[PDB]
Ligand binder design. Structure first.
Ligand SMILES: Nc1ncnc2c1ncn2[C@@H]1O[C@H](COP(=O)(O)OP(=O)(O)OP(=O)(O)O)[C@@H](O)[C@H]1O
Lengths: 83, 78
């Protein structure tokens, strides 16, 4: 009825050793959904032309497929970018 | 301090094909046709061999009959 759309972004910053990765891990553990996908820093770079971008795009495949199939009766997908 | 350094990117040359899909299909079709022709030749050759084997017995029988008849006629004649 309100016609609102959900939020799809969180950023955490601060000095070292203050509880950021802990928050992300516990948030991932809290939600009843699929296992989160975690990226360990610059894991996406490749020596070939185009492969880095294919790697970034292969993260958003399950979400797109489920959105197309199940529409609004779909689960939640979590992606964590470290560093 | 105008000392620059670089990094490299790579590209893959197209694999060996894009000429293996026009002559290839024709080659396969011709191979299939040759296989069918060979099967037909097999069948015909087996039939011909059977017919030759059949002919042999009649040949031998006629030879024996003629020889025996000639010997009998000669024996009675003298
Ligand atoms: N608020 C907190 N409560 C309890 N333990 C904490 C807290 N903050 C940090 N810790 C402890 O410190 C450890 C390291 O903290 P954490 O992994 O969150 O560091 P960080 O903020 O990611 O730092 P960095 O910038 O180096 O990545 C945690 O595993 C936990 O044991």
């Amino acid at each position: 009825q309100m016609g609102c759309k959900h939020v799809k972004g969180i950023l955490l910053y601060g000095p070292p050793g203050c509880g950021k990765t802990l928050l992300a891990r516990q948030i991932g553990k809290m939600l009843n959904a699929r296992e989160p996908k975690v990226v360990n820093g610059p894991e996406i770079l490749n020596k070939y032309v185009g492969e880095s971008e294919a790697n970034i795009r292969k993260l958003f495949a399950d979400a797109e497929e489920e959105q197309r199939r199940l529409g609004a009766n779909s689960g939640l997908h979590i992606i964590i970018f470290d560093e | 301090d105008m000392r620059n350094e670089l990094e490299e990117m790579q590209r893959r040359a197209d694999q060996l094909a894009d000429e293996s899909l026009e002559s290839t299909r024709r080659m396969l079709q011709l191979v299939e046709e040759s296989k069918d022709a060979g099967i037909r030749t097999l069948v015909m050759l087996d039939e011909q061999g059977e017919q030759l084997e059949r002919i042999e017995e009649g040949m031998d029988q006629i030879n024996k009959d003629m020889k025996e008849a000639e010997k009998n006629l000669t024996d009675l004649g003298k």
